[PDB]
Symmetry: C4
Subunit: 394 residues, 4 copies
């Protein structure tokens, strides 16, 4: 539809025109959208014809705005249009805020079990392990199999995500970040299961990365808290901007001076590349040692290089990072609030695709009528209107 094409392109005012058109005329009130049926004292209650929600149409409007390729003009502004911008706010505060707190209650109990199942792993060699008859490790084995079940669940739900939309590996990390991470978490969980029954001890590597990834995915549920949520968006957008560009520059100076200080070292402990690449990394933390070796010639060469390193990377790049974060904070400061708004909207749509077997609340704010007039006949039983309200504005 040209409605959906105005959305799927991102033409912003056109969509404001369509969703709010007004006509008090015979054979044309059936052409109008915004039905100001209660124009009482200053609150202007209005009703909206609502072919936009996904329960109405197939390939409907909100799924179009939410699932876009993020190369559109302003996808983060088309949710601000007055019929939609309270329809989600209704659906959240009425319906999905209950079930969203539920999953975050489940997922917090998923990680605590997966924590304690890993914290009390057995130390003896050769996996897998015969469960002892003591009543303690039955909790371990139940804790083990519960935690694998989450790795199963996030595996299919990661797939049946991607088996729908197919973001084609360029929109994948671009917009659908932190949906990859739940898949990658589950992916490490299954490789840990594979090696646990293929008897090799290296499963616990895969268990560990599945666990550190898992706790950091508890930042996902900071959406649904607009204080925390907009904050966590900035943490995403600083990683995808100030780590691909910062850590290239830092690794040049690191791996540059780390190489120049190897070849100066004649022999001894730090004569490998790796063991001195830590020792120059410790300067960045704040544990750098200036006299961390002596087995070389030309001490003046050695301490010019450390001082050329520490000046360039500790007091100059790491302070340049704090600047360029702060200069890029103010730009993101309003745009990230928009990205929060859209991420809640995806969670709202994702649950109606989930909670479809109980779809009595799938409609929003009216299904009866607001028209009562059509050129083809009666219109007092259709157009499934949404009751709204308004302010004074004198």
């Amino acid at each position: 539809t040209p409605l959906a094409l105005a959305a799927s392109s991102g033409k912003i005012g056109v969509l404001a025109y369509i969703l709010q058109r007004e006509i008090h005329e015979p054979e044309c009130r059936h052409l109008s959208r915004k039905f100001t049926e209660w124009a009482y004292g200053p609150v202007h209650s209005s009703l909206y014809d609502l072919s936009c929600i996904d329960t109405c149409e197939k390939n409907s409007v909100l799924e179009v705005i939410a699932y876009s390729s993020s190369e559109t003009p302003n996808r983060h502004d088309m949710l601000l249009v007055e019929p939609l911008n309270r329809l989600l706010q209704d659906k959240w505060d009425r319906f999905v805020k209950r079930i969203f707190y539920f999953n975050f209650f489940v997922y917090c109990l998923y990680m605590i079990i997966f924590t304690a199942a890993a914290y009390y792993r057995p130390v003896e060699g050769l996996p897998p392990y015969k469960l002892k008859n003591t009543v303690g490790d039955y909790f371990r084995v139940t804790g083990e199999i519960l935690s694998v079940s989450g790795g199963v669940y996030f595996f299919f739900r990661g797939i049946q995500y991607f088996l729908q939309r197919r973001p084609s590996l360029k929109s994948l990390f671009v917009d659908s970040y932190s949906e990859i991470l739940f898949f990658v978490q589950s992916l490490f969980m299954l490789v840990s299961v594979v090696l646990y029954f293929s008897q090799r001890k290296e499963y616990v590597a895969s268990m560990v990365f599945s666990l550190a990834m898992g706790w950091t995915n508890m930042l996902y549920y900071t959406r649904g808290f607009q204080q925390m949520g907009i904050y966590a968006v900035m943490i995403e957008k600083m990683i995808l901007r100030d780590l691909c560009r910062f850590m290239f520059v830092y690794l040049v100076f690191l791996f540059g001076f780390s190489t120049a200080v190897v070849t100066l070292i004649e022999d001894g402990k730090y004569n490998s590349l790796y063991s001195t690449c830590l020792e120059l990394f410790k300067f960045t933390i704040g544990m750098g040692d200036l006299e961390f070796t002596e087995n070389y010639d030309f001490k003046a060469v050695f301490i010019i290089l450390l001082l050329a390193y520490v000046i360039l990377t500790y007091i100059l790049l790491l302070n340049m990072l704090i600047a360029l974060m702060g200069e890029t904070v103010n730009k993101i400061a309003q745009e990230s609030k928009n990205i929060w708004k859209l991420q809640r909207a995806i969670t709202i749509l994702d649950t109606e695709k989930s909670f479809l077997k109980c779809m009595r609340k799938a409609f929003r704010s009216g299904k009866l009528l607001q028209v009562g007039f059509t050129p083809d006949g009666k219109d007092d039983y259709r157009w499934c209107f949404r009751v709204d309200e308004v302010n004074w504005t004198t």
Copy 2:
């Protein structure tokens, strides 16, 4: 009154209309408020009818503006209105600046005694302790009983605060912060008295938290110094904003990677959760050790996790904190000055509720007359006016 209701709602211009109305008309100069009785050369001296100060009315205006729920429109701007905004400035520089410096002189001597009484506590077991006949520890015992007396005084004064206003546990930490802290300080002081006579050595835990809390409550008296005071407001508003949101994100990455590095550790010293949760906390300070253990398998897994931790939390979150403080400084930069202004106003009102037995200075800047005309008769002895002054403005 509609005057008080304009204040208690926070309607800002309405209150500017009421406190400054002007009428030079028969039967209506008794209806006017602002009496420009000396409209001389450019300084325009004026007198104000003053039913606003608390000595005039019951449930009067300044107590309404000060004790609000902070969900009002602009409580921090209704003190800027010209009759009030110099009336407090008069009351401070005339009356309460003397007594405010007194209490801060007392409280500084309260803490020094409570310091030295704790610094010279006896080391021998089994509290309480028989006072030796040497003349030294009589100063200790007097120092002990003086310091408990402050714990008594701040206990009732914390209660008889709350027994008046009842901020109902939501406005409590919101606006009446740093009045809780004096109550919590005294609360730890009394539990320390309880355990000191119930013979258990754990009283000194309660003494210590009563002491660290006590010295940090010496920031309370930075109000009354507009240099220091506005500064200390920013320290409050960054804690109540950038610690509930920062320390959630930090504790995720901490307790995430702290768990992932436990289960990698096979056995030894750091195989507990707590002992490695310090070792990852030391990276935040600047004392983090990269090779702080060796008793594991898969060294590459271990040092990916530290490097994934240090990149994410030491060079990225802790620099993001400095950004988001600075982006939120400029917003607070003017608003905190308003919050300082209102906190002085509460201290001004709180002392007239205290120093009521000597209430000769409880009136402000005139009680005689400025009207001399009323429709009901004479008006040359009432309306308790406040003498003001003005500038040129050509």
Copy 3:
């Protein structure tokens, strides 16, 4: 020409007038520049007479704008003029982006060879060294002679740069920075060759500085990536501004308090100037020790000086640096983007001076005609036009 003189002075609107003049008139369309030959529906295709590119004229326009002394009015804005500003964009995306990625592929393989040739240097004394008959060190000797060849190549190319332009030692470090560094890198490489055959072991000092300089010159190729490139310009402009001014102030406080703490030290390890000038430098990193010696008198004097040092330089200058970077970031934030644009332009011009033996692509976007009218006769075969395009603008 007055065209070139408008460029070489930096008069900005004059150059916009010349490169875009329009005339539809007999005996005067041969005087016009901008030939709007396809004024179709909203895209306005236009053709440009193009005496500006260096293949047309000797001492031509882009070489004038690029090779300026940087004391001009806005050299970083004269490349924004519509004929040029897409002509380079054409030449990059058509021609030189291929060869620029090639050299950065070569130079990355140059450094890896020069890395491994240094990483596996022999430890035995008395250079030079007889190559063993084992097949391993033939890779070393080939790696050695390949790496010297780069030192030869960057030596002449550094000279035949300077043998052209002669920036006269004031414009040298000012604008032609990071062209010096490739010369200085090669310069250390040759001194390393000299000492390697003059049998003294101090060649490896010169090898090392040639190597740390070499990896940091891999930041040169961040131009050609507008994300990374504008970022790396800021790293240049903060060094040439906030190191000549910061490190003077820091070295005053360093060498001040380092001297005042020597003379307090009576005898022992740290009684030299250098050994305590490190110990006060360690405070800047985060490894400063407050009790790092005891062999003095007047401990209170010693720890006042450290605390006077640490207050003044660790919590006050190093936080002042982060401020004054960030206050100077916003000023540079747009200007550095312009300096990136001009640095790409120099690389574009530098390759046509290089790739001249294959100059079939040396022309840009047309050589045939756009005029077809002249007062002296025919004009349908000259003026070597550049086909452009445009937008709608209603």
Copy 4:
């Protein structure tokens, strides 16, 4: 004069009116100030009657503007007025820039001698010391007596400064900061001489503070370099603002938690107040140890206090400092440039009070005439004009 009273009050436009008045009229060109005697093509050369420089009048204008109490309206803007603002620029670039570089060349050689005289002090007890007949320590004794001579010179020049102006102990540290420091440096130098002949070894305390103070006074000569000079003004204004207010807040939390952690410590090394007040100070540097003692009860109490300390002062105050510096940088960013301008002006005036015995250059840019007309008679030999020049402005 009303001219001087317009300056000494700081009325800014009035002074612009007086110094630039124009009259082409009989009996009134002798009343005019700005004589536009060469109104040629676009450069408008002009001459100025110049009763403003101190060689003309007693209690003259520049000494009034420079020596103000800094409670004036805009003392940092009255030097921007067109006759003055190039007159100092003339006097600097013609006359005093030569002698200013001289003193900074002397003072740099003063400190190097005073450095080496202290660096090679004798270690043997009981001052003073018999000079050995070896030729080495004659350089020491000459170095000693040269360095005392600077302590003599800065003593009187510090006094005969103050014996003129008498800033009355409130304007002293306010505006005449870094003139105190040269007096305090010399003051420590003389006390070091006193104790060196009163045979007590504690002179070297006074020598040391005289030396660390001395090198940091080499920041004084950063005026005269407008790059470095404006930078060094910011270092002054951040100390006098963000140390009286920061270090109060920090010392509360320091001395608060340092006391609360003493009384928890039962006995041992750190059971003194001072020895643990360092250990909590080390957290601010980056060398804080969390397990720095064990001799207590209630470990959980001990590490809550460190973590309550480190959260509050290391990641929260020290990041709040970087914010509030940067928010106060932008405000100072233009005002400090004005304070630089005025500090050069004081140095210009201070040398004519010094170099008065050679006062042939004490006049500025003309003494002959520009009037040639007066109501009382001839005016072709007075009013000591200053030749200026101008720009085009079409």
